[PDB]
Design an enzyme around this catalytic site. Structure first.
Site, PDB file in Angstrom:
ATOM      1  N   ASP A  28      26.016  -2.168 -29.684  1.00  0.00           N
ATOM      2  CA  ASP A  28      26.842  -1.036 -29.282  1.00  0.00           C
ATOM      3  C   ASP A  28      26.044  -0.060 -28.428  1.00  0.00           C
ATOM      4  O   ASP A  28      25.280   0.753 -28.956  1.00  0.00           O
ATOM      5  CB  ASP A  28      27.340  -0.321 -30.543  1.00  0.00           C
ATOM      6  CG  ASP A  28      28.223   0.866 -30.236  1.00  0.00           C
ATOM      7  OD1 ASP A  28      28.647   0.982 -29.073  1.00  0.00           O
ATOM      8  OD2 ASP A  28      28.498   1.666 -31.168  1.00  0.00           O
TER       9      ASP A  28
ATOM     10  N   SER B  69      31.336   6.499 -11.658  1.00  0.00           N
ATOM     11  CA  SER B  69      31.971   5.527 -10.780  1.00  0.00           C
ATOM     12  C   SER B  69      32.477   6.232  -9.529  1.00  0.00           C
ATOM     13  O   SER B  69      32.886   7.393  -9.569  1.00  0.00           O
ATOM     14  CB  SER B  69      33.127   4.827 -11.516  1.00  0.00           C
ATOM     15  OG  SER B  69      33.884   4.000 -10.653  1.00  0.00           O
TER      16      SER B  69
END
Length: 330
Positions: free
Chosen positions: A35, A199
């Site tokens: 994770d 992004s």
């Protein structure tokens, strides 16, 4: 040194991925959920409340000649999905794919929430975010990666998750045969303890690319792709009959649909998520309403590039003094 381990979806939907991890001496192999959105290595154990164990493999520290109680240390974690666990702490030898760390903090669960009990395939979590998020008190502990880092050939790990198939986590090297083209690297902020990046935009299907900054985290422990409501609405608007259902808890779509791809930007590069990766199947057995793999982050407080996004790429988690993230197509 290096390590290389195969990671395997837990079910036919890729709800999560499990990777075998050797703990203790002799080795006890547990299947952990790696994770990159948390920083605790915790396991079901011989100390876990019996009624909260249902099919998991447990770590028994009393059977490990290298286990030592980390005296006075406790831990308690709550995840973004509302699940939780807590307990005490041992140090022990932990190996992943041939890479060994001695003195790793292994957090033994005394209590786990129902969602963990109900998932027989996940024996615990191995956190790979920054050690500043580790919950052990009163002495915060380091992640497996942080402990291994100085010994690694290069201070990196890579995630290569499969679509409805196994994939690979590598430590200490970049497998140049595992991706196509080049890897585009992008800046990381560690201010919140995550692999947080920005992004450069998105496209829906064959549509034009929208240049827009989307701050989010690269999170292997989250199943879906969670993005701003504007982006998510633009995606589902291209699927006839798709709608946001408050009763179901997100966007659903007719199972008869063909889903468009979704592209996200990494610098000037583009990662394309095929439409099929966005299908999470019937909301309940036999239903013709299917759950979408792109959902709104509104009310999470952060955008999350979870498995839906990451499995479309070869992803480099570069833990150099100034960390960065790399993405390649594959």
């Amino acid at each position: 040194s290096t390590g290389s381990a195969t990671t395997t979806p837990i079910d036919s939907l890729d709800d999560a991925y499990i990777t075998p991890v050797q703990i203790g001496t002799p080795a006890q192999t547990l299947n952990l959920d790696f994770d990159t959105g948390s920083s605790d290595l915790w396991v079901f154990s011989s100390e876990t409340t019996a009624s909260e164990v249902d099919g998991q493999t447990i770590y028994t520290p009393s059977k490990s000649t290298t286990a030592k109680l980390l005296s006075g240390a406790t831990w308690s974690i709550s995840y973004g999905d509302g699940s939780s666990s807590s307990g005490d702490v041992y140090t022990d030898t932990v190996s992943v794919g041939g890479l060994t760390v001695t003195g790793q903090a292994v957090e033994s669960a005394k209590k786990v929430s129902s969602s963990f009990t109900e998932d027989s395939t996940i024996d615990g979590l191995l956190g790979l975010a920054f050690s500043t998020l580790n919950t052990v008190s009163p002495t915060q502990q380091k992640t497996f990666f942080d402990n291994a880092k100085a010994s690694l050939d290069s201070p990196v790990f890579t995630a290569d998750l499969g679509y409805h198939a196994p994939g690979t986590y590598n430590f200490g090297f970049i497998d140049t045969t595992a991706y196509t083209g080049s890897i585009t690297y992008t800046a990381v902020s560690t201010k919140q303890g995550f692999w947080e990046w920005t992004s450069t935009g998105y496209a829906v299907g064959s549509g034009t690319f929208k240049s827009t900054s989307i701050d989010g985290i690269a999170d292997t422990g989250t199943t879906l792709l969670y993005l701003p409501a504007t982006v998510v609405s633009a995606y589902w608007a291209q699927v006839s009959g798709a709608k946001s259902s408050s009763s179901v808890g997100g966007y659903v779509f007719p199972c008869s649909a063909t889903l468009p791809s979704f592209t996200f930007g990494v610098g000037s590069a583009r990662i394309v998520i095929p439409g099929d990766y966005i299908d999470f199947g019937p909301i309940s057995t036999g239903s013709s309403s299917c759950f979408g793999g792109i959902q709104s982050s509104a009310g999470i407080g952060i955008n999350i590039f979870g498995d839906v996004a990451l499995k479309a790429a070869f992803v480099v988690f570069n833990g150099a003094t100034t960390p960065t993230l790399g993405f390649a197509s594959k």
